[PDB]
Amino acid sequence: SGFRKMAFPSGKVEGCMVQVTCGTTTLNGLWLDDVVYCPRHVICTSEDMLNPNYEDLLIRKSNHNFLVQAGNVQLRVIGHSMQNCVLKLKVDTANPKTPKYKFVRIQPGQTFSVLACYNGSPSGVYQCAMRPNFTIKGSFLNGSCGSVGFNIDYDCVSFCYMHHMELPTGVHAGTDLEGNFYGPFVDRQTAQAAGTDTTITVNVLAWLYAAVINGDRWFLNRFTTTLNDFNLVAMKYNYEPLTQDHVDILGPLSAQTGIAVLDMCASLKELLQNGMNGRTILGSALLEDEFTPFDVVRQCSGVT
Amino acid sequence: SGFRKMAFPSGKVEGCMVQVTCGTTTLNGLWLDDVVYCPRHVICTSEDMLNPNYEDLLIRKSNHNFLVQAGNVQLRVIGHSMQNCVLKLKVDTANPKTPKYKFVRIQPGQTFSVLACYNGSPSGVYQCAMRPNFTIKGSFLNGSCGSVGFNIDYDCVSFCYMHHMELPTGVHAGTDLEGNFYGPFVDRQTAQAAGTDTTITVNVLAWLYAAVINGDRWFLNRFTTTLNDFNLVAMKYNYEPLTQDHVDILGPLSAQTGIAVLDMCASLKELLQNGMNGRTILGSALLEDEFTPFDVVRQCSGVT
Ligand SMILES: Cc1ccncc1NC(=O)C[C@H]1C[C@@H]2C[C@@H]2C1
Numbered sequence: 001s002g003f004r005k006m007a008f009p010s011g012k013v014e015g016c017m018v019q020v021t022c023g024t025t026t027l028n029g030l031w032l033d034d035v036v037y038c039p040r041h042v043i044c045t046s047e048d049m050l051n052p053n054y055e056d057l058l059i060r061k062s063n064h065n066f067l068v069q070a071g072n073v074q075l076r077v078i079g080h081s082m083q084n085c086v087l088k089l090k091v092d093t094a095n096p097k098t099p100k101y102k103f104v105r106i107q108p109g110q111t112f113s114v115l116a117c118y119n120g121s122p123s124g125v126y127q128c129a130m131r132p133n134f135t136i137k138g139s140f141l142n143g144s145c146g147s148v149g150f151n152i153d154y155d156c157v158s159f160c161y162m163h164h165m166e167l168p169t170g171v172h173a174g175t176d177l178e179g180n181f182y183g184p185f186v187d188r189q190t191a192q193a194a195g196t197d198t199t200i201t202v203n204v205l206a207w208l209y210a211a212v213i214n215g216d217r218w219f220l221n222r223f224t225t226t227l228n229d230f231n232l233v234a235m236k237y238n239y240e241p242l243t244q245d246h247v248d249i250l251g252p253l254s255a256q257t258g259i260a261v262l263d264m265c266a267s268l269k270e271l272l273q274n275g276m277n278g279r280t281i282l283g284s285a286l287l288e289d290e291f292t293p294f295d296v297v298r299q300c301s302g303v304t
Numbered sequence: 305s306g307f308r309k310m311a312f313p314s315g316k317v318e319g320c321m322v323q324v325t326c327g328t329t330t331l332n333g334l335w336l337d338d339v340v341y342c343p344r345h346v347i348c349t350s351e352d353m354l355n356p357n358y359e360d361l362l363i364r365k366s367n368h369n370f371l372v373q374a375g376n377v378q379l380r381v382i383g384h385s386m387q388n389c390v391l392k393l394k395v396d397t398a399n400p401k402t403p404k405y406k407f408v409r410i411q412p413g414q415t416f417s418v419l420a421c422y423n424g425s426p427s428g429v430y431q432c433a434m435r436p437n438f439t440i441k442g443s444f445l446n447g448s449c450g451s452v453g454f455n456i457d458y459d460c461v462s463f464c465y466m467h468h469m470e471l472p473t474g475v476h477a478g479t480d481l482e483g484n485f486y487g488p489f490v491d492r493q494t495a496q497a498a499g500t501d502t503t504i505t506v507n508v509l510a511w512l513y514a515a516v517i518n519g520d521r522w523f524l525n526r527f528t529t530t531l532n533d534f535n536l537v538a539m540k541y542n543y544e545p546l547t548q549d550h551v552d553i554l555g556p557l558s559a560q561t562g563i564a565v566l567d568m569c570a571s572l573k574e575l576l577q578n579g580m581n582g583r584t585i586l587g588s589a590l591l592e593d594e595f596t597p598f599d600v601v602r603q604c605s606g607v608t
């Protein structure tokens with residue numbers, strides 16, 4: 001009973017957080033095996049950040065300029081390389097707390113947990129979604145760079161995000177663990193505007209299924225619709241187009257509740273056209289889009 | 305930038321979760337030092353649960369009837385006692401992962417993180433608040449009993465909640481770590497109705513301060529009010545009465561933003577009387593009450 005914005009247990013990721021200092025800049029690093037991963041902008045000063053040439057800036061840096069601290073102990077840096085927008089610092093010791101892990105580049109609409117850190121130390125954990133404009137609506141202050149986004153499948157941590165930037169609008173930008181930014185963002189102190197933040201339609205539908213499962217049924221109507229009819233409405237309300245792929249992954253939720261996917265789309269259509277009328281769904285007065293169909297199944301079944 | 309419903313890092317609590325089985329019932333236990341804490345209803349069968357006499361039921365249980373498993377290894381039970389509604393199972397081994405900890409009984413309106421578990425294993429972490437009717441709006445399925453609520457002050461874990469029940473309305477009831485239930489609930493399969501779930505006024509004000517800090521200012525008005533005037537409005541909208549104590553703890557937020565507490569109360573008053581008019585505050589279309597003034601300060605400053 002009850003449905004909550006739930007994050008993965010953060011322990012496996014806490015054991016990987018370290019503090020990386022280069023010159024006067026301190027941010028977070030992710031220590032897995034004998035490698036520490038961090039944003040390459042750790043090598044920048046405030047003047048460098050305007051238009052930095054990272055290859056040129058990295059020439060003046062040696063292994064001994066990167067100070068890596070795990071807890072209160074210093075790690076010895078025996079190598080350093082730049083991969084896209086991340087620096088990989090080879091240390092002489094494998095992290096004894098290295099969990100089983102993968103590096104995955106997620107698609108927009110996918111959710112993940114963020115372990116927000118400062119000075120290599122965790123401050124908190126929350127659940128995020130890669131927005132369709134490739135930004136994330138996080139909670140990050142100066143010093144949080146290098147904090148990571150992840151998912152967990154039983155014992156394997158899939159790292160998907162590393163925090164790098166705060167856009168002038170207060171939304172966040174970052175890379176996968178190979179250093180490639182999500183979206184068109186560049187690691188530079190230049191105004192970069194975000195594109196349209198559309199609603200993740202499949203996630204809203206998954207959350208309407210979670211609501212039916214947990215007792216909130218007022219929004220269920222006597223109507224049905226078609227993919228094409230629904231999508232005309234979704235385009236009007238800046239909702240992502242729904243595909244047969246999205247319908248397919250909603251199948252187990254559709255089967256559990258006995259509510260066909262297209263019927264739920266018609267409920268969503270009326271919710272878009274008429275609003276909530278001062279009512280709530282799962283304690284929210286708006287349509288929640290940061291639960292994937294997989295998150296709903298996991299939470300509603302108790303996967304550990 | 306950005307404000308999120310953030311939970312504490314869960315690692316220190318994950319290292320304490322174990323599985324407790326008694327007869328055919330399996331739930332979660334909290335292993336701290338050489339003691340495992342769990343709900344006493346682990347000794348009940350489905351027939352016992354209607355009107356259980358726990359003292360009588362515990363007479364038929366010996367140390368060897370309580371199966372405690374931490375990971376894949378079995379803990380030896382050398383003692384067992386009942387304290388209010390929790391069982392304390394003395395084991396022969398201190399938990400090597402025991403963090404620094406305290407047991408605290410929280411007041412309504414206070415927030416905490418829940419590490420939801422099944423079979424001694426973590427499934428996820430979310431942020432909760434002890435409602436003014438002493439229930440929590442969690443996300444718990446059968447097998448989640450024994451999951452705990454906690455806060456963290458640097459390295460010390462303050463355990464405040466242990467999950468015991470799901471009321472017939474889908475809201476949750478439980479105890480502090482001394483086994484005393486929050487509210488009037490009893491650990492029995494009897495319909496127990498909850499009282500009025502009032503809104504935590506001080507928390508809503510703290511969240512309006514978080515919104516001003518993060519850029520959402522549309523709700524700021526040209527008005528002020530008094531404690532007595534505000535409270536007449538708060539009573540009408542089932543909001544908890546605001547006291548000078550609540551005003552005092554909002555002081556650092558009032559000082560940071562330069563917005564007097566009574567001015568913010570007048571903004572809240574107009575929000576209650578006029579609604580949001582289809583607008584949002586920190587991505588919410590309703591007034592969020594599960595951030596304490598302390599949570600806002602912590603998040604907005606980056607406390608780790
Ligand atoms: C100030 C802050 C708050 C939260 N998250 C991140 C930041 N930092 C930045 O955005 C700095 C950017 C500019 C320079 C190339 C690097 C990234």
Ligand SMILES: Cc1ccncc1NC(=O)C[C@H]1C[C@@H]2C[C@@H]2C1
Pocket residue numbers: 001345353444445446447448449468469470471491492493
């Ligand atoms: C079924 C479920 C789901 C989520 N959280 C808890 C539960 N379990 C119960 O409520 C059983 C109660 C009755 C018996 C005396 C014990 C507590």
